[PDB]
Design a protein. Structure first.
Lengths: 236, 236
């Protein structure tokens, strides 16, 4: 291990909690605030908790990043994550962006795992996983590669699962519970050859989910709190 | 050349016109019918014409395929296509499926070119091209790869452009006016190693475009006709 966070506490030398108004990105419904990021117990475990909450028609959730604190290149990153049932608008994600001062998408983005896509709500919202890379010199010149597939068993089953990215000069390889899920070829792609930092978030609604109006949100009701739990993250 | 259709006439030994009700696939708005496929003049060219038409809140367009008539494996295929302005819900495509009796996606699908995607309408709808592969043993076990980016200049500029697919045991490579656009690795993808037939269509609305309600269609007014033109297709 080059780095491990077991989430016995929220380490401000490594992570920053984000604060944003509703609809900051992707027509998302949640506001992000510090109060919806916590470290606490889940049975015998000490875990990072990102909490989506609805209070009337207002939605709050959590997002963290390691920008300017922890970044790496050409290493394996793994996280153990327990995901909420996403059907009806939840959008959890484990991802990376270039540790530089370039605006997205020119910083590069690696979406290791996201769930909650519009199309999973034919198919099985509990099994449908999306991985992606985004790049290009501006929002006008955005390029994306995308893979979507259903794993064998629910990933939204009350258990922790391991999400991995293997990274070298040629390939980004995503694995789930140590089984290869997809490879992106970065051998000629100039955006994936510098330090990247880590993000975790629990978005609510947004274009990815197909829910961009609070009146269409079915997965979070008035007063409800739904959690995304990260037991640990390691860089080998 | 293995095969060329210059479209001096509609050759029923190669092509079939499709007939389908609105909403048959992808939440599309158009009905397909034989009347909206024709072969005709475009200046001094003889071309295949797919015509999208609105009559009140009814939408009609054209779609052909070569299933059971013309199929091939591991050859370059090229077509010269003039596209309408897609902004507001038109979805033209040039694509291929496996020439077998497996139901999509187990027959395999290569989307060589599509325009009209939702995000193109922060993007540039005249430049944004989508290419994709779909595969997997059933709809429940659907897998998809896609790539989206702009090319340099408008493809919706009143001129014909050449869309090319190179295909060997390792790679599917899409080119647009002889500039390589994207490569999919199929070396270990068992769905892209048998005969495929050819399709052309002009869809109106559908999930891809983000318009699935005629009340959100802006690209086809009541009484309007728009054409997609194919001057030729060839297999080398």
């Amino acid at each position: 291990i080059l780095f491990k966070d077991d989430f016995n506490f929220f380490d401000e030398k490594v992570w920053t909690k984000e604060t944003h108004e509703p609809g900051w990105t992707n027509q998302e419904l949640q506001a992000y605030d510090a109060a919806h990021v916590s470290v606490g117990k889940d049975g015998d475990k000490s875990v990072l908790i990102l909490t989506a909450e609805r209070k009337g028609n207002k939605i709050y959730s959590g997002r963290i990043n390691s920008k300017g604190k922890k970044s790496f290149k050409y290493r394996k990153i793994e996280a153990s994550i327990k995901l909420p049932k996403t059907n009806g608008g939840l959008w959890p994600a484990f991802w990376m962006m270039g540790d530089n001062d370039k605006q997205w998408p020119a910083c590069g983005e690696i979406d290791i795992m996201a769930m909650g896509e519009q199309s999973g709500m034919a198919g099985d919202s509990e099994k449908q996983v999306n991985t992606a890379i985004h790049y290009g010199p501006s929002a006008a010149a955005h390029e994306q590669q995308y893979y979507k597939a259903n794993v064998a068993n629910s990933l939204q089953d009350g258990n922790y699962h391991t999400y991995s990215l293997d990274w070298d000069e040629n390939n980004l390889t995503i694995s789930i519970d140590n089984v290869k899920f997809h490879t992106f070829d970065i051998s000629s792609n100039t955006y994936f050859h510098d330090n990247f930092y880590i993000l975790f978030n629990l978005a609510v609604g947004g274009a990815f989910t197909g829910i961009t109006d609070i009146n269409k949100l079915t997965g979070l009701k008035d007063g409800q709190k739904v959690n995304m739990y990260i037991d640990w993250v390691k860089i080998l």
